[PDB]
Design a protein around this ligand. Structure first.
Ligand SMILES: [Co+2]
Length: 207
């Protein structure tokens, strides 16, 4: 059936979702899994939310990323409103209207990271490696654990991403032949659901 997960909400805001969840036989839960169908985000009146991890994984699964206004209007009108009307416009960081989740629902037959080998490299911070790995998988990429493990083949394009405010490196180029980008290449590529160009994102590689 329907299974719901919640993001950016207060206790009382949560209680409202639960009431809506109880009234409509919807499972509510703490952590997002593949079983999750809906991700309720807090937004401003014009469906703009902050980009949480559940935001990305939600879009990565191409679920229903939908504003908390879905919940309260549904309570107000005493009926389960259309998810279509309430979906999240975009976010505070990628722009007030990129309609990201929209494309993601519409494009499961061709996922943006199809045909790619991705290596989430070294230390990571707000987001753990495995979440980013699962994100990246969900969008049709193939995870590599170590640089040396890239399918050296005309077939696939390998990418290495890193987030550099963690290593408390620019010599990945010396250990493998791959584009090195910044974790924001993935996050934006997922937020916008377009496959971003690596130029704006490349980390310098010393010879
Ligand atoms: Co090519």
């Amino acid at each position: 059936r329907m299974s719901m997960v919640v993001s950016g909400l207060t206790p009382e805001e949560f209680m409202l979702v639960y009431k809506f969840a109880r009234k409509h036989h919807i499972t509510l839960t703490n952590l997002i899994t593949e079983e999750t169908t809906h991700v309720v985000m807090k937004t401003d009146a014009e469906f703009v939310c902050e980009r949480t991890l559940k935001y990305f994984l939600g879009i990565a699964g191409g679920k229903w990323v939908v504003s908390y206004f879905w919940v309260t209007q549904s309570i107000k009108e005493r009926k389960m409103l259309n998810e279509h009307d309430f979906e999240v416009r975009g976010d505070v960081v990628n722009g007030r209207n990129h309609q990201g989740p929209k494309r993601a629902r519409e494009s499961q037959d061709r996922k943006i990271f199809r045909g790619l080998e991705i290596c989430c490299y070294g230390p990571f911070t707000n987001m753990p490696t495995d979440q980013l790995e699962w994100m990246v998988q969900l969008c049709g990429a193939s995870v590599v654990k170590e640089l040396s493990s890239f399918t050296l083949g005309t077939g696939v394009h390998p990418i290495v991403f890193v987030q550099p405010d963690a290593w408390t490196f620019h010599a990945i180029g010396q250990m493998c032949e791959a584009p090195v980008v910044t974790r924001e290449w993935v996050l934006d590529s997922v937020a916008l659901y377009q496959c971003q160009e690596l130029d704006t994102y490349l980390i310098p590689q010393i010879p």
